């Protein structure tokens, strides 16, 4: 009919949702977690510095073995790093150097990379020929590519600088599902531990939870004042943390449908570039435009510590599946491994 | 201590050596962002550079190896990707001078310049403003007064003054008058002059960067 009908019905729904949320907020996280003893100061040391890159690192991802990592830099190289030895396992010559995402497949067979060229290139680490070669050029996005994350050797979920997110089948090279409801650039993805759901942060300050198989947006979260530059699932899959350029992080719980706690400080005017959780979920680590990573008690919402050892923007922040170490990539070109 | 791991260290240092060699190669090449409204404007320069997302054109001129990054097809918010180019040597910015007559496009170009010339990532970064469609702008000036998009304009409706006024109405947008320099040029139909201008501007920007590396500037 008209927006003077359907936008009013949509507004009445948005009010019904906000009322339901305000009805479900019976306590904030602060007064309930006040029963939990504080984490104290988290001193941590740079156990390894990985010096092989030559330009700004944009993304890194830990392998499931908690030993290898992929890292992506606009010098046009992926490097696979043995975090125990500093050994460079592979260095992949990327066909379009303007890369700003990478992922390491949960099997360790494949790595993905992409950026201002819309392709999520899938690289087979374990050929018989012992070079690394492009298995697929996943071409059909139209924006720049901002995240790839493997669900399995045959499926990757990918986010774009256009409106969309897309699930791909590598074997065919075709989109099996396009996720559409994000109005802005979809900056970031994280898969839940079950890989049944993923959550997507966008520049429209919304987060959307997507059913991988149904295609439906199950929930929206909108408490951020500006771009959700980064997102990560809390390691049980029931909650997720959203880093924003508004200089805050917010914890959202899927069942609450609501913001539980905001992490902010007057000194922190820098935006947040990356977030990830320690395996317990107790520490939320956030990278900033300030040359620091802050360690937040995800329950108590205070600074447990600061990882100071950077001299440029922390671009990416992976925590191993074991919780053994925290990797902090930076525009320093250095990649520093912390625990 | 190591046994077979020593061969993985040998591989790691062979990789590091190849990485360093491609770092030399990548620093020896010179990186040019290409920006501007309209496809045909950028296309004209890309064509005149004599030897789908980001489109990258390589050309060698006078034994300098250029990479030119036509970002135009990216149709995505600059704020979330422009910081990739924090280290380009020059921003080639194209605007078709005809755009004043057309559906305000000149104001959109001036706003894009007021951004790119002031964006924090490009603070030290030169701009090469290619004014395109000189001939069509001359023809338009014989038809349409330039005050059609500039109420403040007060001068001769003849090519050289209208051009100079446009060039000023761009160069005065640059707040960072002393960090940046803007190497404005009028696109030559006669070829070999446009890529010669690009080569001279890149030369002078390399000179200024080396002066700052030397701490003389």
């Amino acid at each position, epitope marked *: 009919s008209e927006l003077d009908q359907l936008r009013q019905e949509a507004e009445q729904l948005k009010n019904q949702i906000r009322d339901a949320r305000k009805a479900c907020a019976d306590a904030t996280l602060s007064q309930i977690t006040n029963n939990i003893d504080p984490v104290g100061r988290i001193q941590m040391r740079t156990r390894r510095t990985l010096r092989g890159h030559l330009a700004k690192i944009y993304a890194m991802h830990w392998g499931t073995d908690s030993r290898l990592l992929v890292s992506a830099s606009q010098d046009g190289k992926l490097i696979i790093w*043995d975090s125990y030895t500093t050994n460079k396992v592979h260095a992949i010559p990327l066909r379009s150097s303007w890369v700003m995402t990478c992922a390491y497949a949960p099997s360790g067979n494949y790595v993905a990379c992409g950026g201002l060229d819309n392709i999520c290139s899938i690289y087979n680490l374990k050929t018989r020929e*012992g070079n690394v070669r492009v298995s697929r050029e996943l071409a059909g996005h139209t924006g720049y590519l901002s995240c790839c994350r493997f669900l399995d050797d045959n499926q990757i979920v990918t986010s774009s600088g256009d409106t969309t997110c897309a699930l791909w089948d590598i074997e065919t090279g075709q989109q099996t599902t396009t996720f559409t409801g994000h109005t802005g650039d979809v900056m970031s993805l994280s898969l839940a531990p079950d890989t049944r759901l993923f959550v997507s942060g966008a520049c429209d300050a919304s987060a959307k939870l997507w059913d991988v198989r149904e295609g439906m947006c199950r929930q929206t979260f909108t408490g951020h004042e500006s771009d959700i530059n980064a997102i990560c699932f809390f390691p049980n899959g029931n909650a997720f943390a959203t880093g924003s350029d508004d200089a805050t992080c917010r914890l959202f719980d899927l069942r609450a449908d609501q913001e539980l706690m905001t992490y902010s400080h007057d000194n922190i005017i820098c935006g947040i570039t990356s977030v990830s959780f320690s395996k317990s979920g107790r520490l939320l680590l956030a990278g900033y435009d300030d040359f620091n990573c802050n360690v937040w008690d995800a329950l108590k919402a205070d600074r447990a510590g600061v990882l100071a050892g950077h001299d440029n923007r922390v671009s990416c922040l992976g925590v191993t599946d074991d919780g053994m170490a925290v990797a902090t990539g930076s525009w320093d070109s250095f990649l520093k491994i912390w625990n | 201590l190591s046994a077979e791991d*020593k061969a993985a260290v040998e591989r790691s240092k062979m990789i590091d050596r190849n990485l360093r060699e491609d770092g030399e190669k990548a620093a020896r090449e010179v990186k040019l962002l290409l920006l501007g409204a309209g496809e045909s404007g950028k296309s004209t320069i890309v064509k005149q550079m004599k030897i789908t997302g980001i489109v990258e054109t390589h050309f060698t001129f006078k034994d300098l190896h250029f990479k030119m990054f036509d970002v135009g097809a990216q149709r995505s918010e600059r704020k979330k990707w422009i910081h990739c180019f924090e280290g380009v040597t020059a921003i080639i910015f194209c605007v078709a001078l005809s755009d004043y007559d057309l559906v305000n496009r000149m104001h959109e170009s001036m706003k894009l310049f007021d951004s790119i010339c002031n964006n924090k990532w490009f603070t030290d970064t030169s701009i090469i403003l290619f004014l395109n469609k000189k001939d069509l702008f001359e023809e338009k000036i014989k038809k349409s007064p330039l005050t059609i998009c500039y109420p403040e304009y007060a001068g001769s409706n003849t090519y050289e003054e209208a051009a100079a006024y446009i060039q000023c109405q761009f160069e005065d947008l640059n707040k960072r008058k002393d960090t940046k320099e803007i190497y404005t040029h009028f696109t030559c139909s006669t070829d070999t002059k446009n890529v010669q201008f690009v080569f001279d501007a890149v030369t002078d920007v390399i000179i200024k960067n080396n002066l700052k590396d030397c701490g003389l500037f």
Partner: single-chain antibody
Amino acid sequence: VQLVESGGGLVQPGGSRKLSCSASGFAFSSFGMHWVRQAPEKGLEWVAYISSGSGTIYYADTVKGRFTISRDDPKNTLFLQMTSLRSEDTAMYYCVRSIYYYGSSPFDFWGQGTTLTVSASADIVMTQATSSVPVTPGESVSISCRSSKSLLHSNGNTYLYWFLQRPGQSPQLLIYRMSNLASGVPDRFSGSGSGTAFTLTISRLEAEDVGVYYCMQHLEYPLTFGAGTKLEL
């Protein structure tokens, strides 16, 4: 992936000859290369190594200085030049590729070899406990070796390797670092050990499993092989 070797035949004793292998279908510059030799009835023994960068060359003490190993990466070809080659150097030689990184499978591909007929301590001893064992399809068999040193290095790898050589073909990698199977190996092979005593189990035994099984260590050069156990169907 192929490794085609040539430069063999009859030689007069104490002469010289240049053994060659052309690589095809793999990134030869990326790989280290080994030569392994099999005496006309004895077991495998290592000859030389040249790494990916053409550095860290090594030779066995039984050939050290007498042979020299070289490679031509721009020609994808490998060149074992043998000098002063003595009667005990008569063997079937094998070109063997290797690549070294976390989770790599070195010795994965062994070329078809070349016959060379010469006209007539301080190392790990692989005490392969038995020369032959009889087996039948569907049986189960335990093959064992002892190493004169614990292969469980400080990093927790056990540098034990197992190969099968089927009659009339070149050896093939079955298991690397005690408990990892090579690509294309049936999942019914399974290796285990303490770091110093080891077993290979061959469950659901198949007529394709027949041949000689060679253990090998990689904790220290020289890469001493065991004497091999023949499985007789």
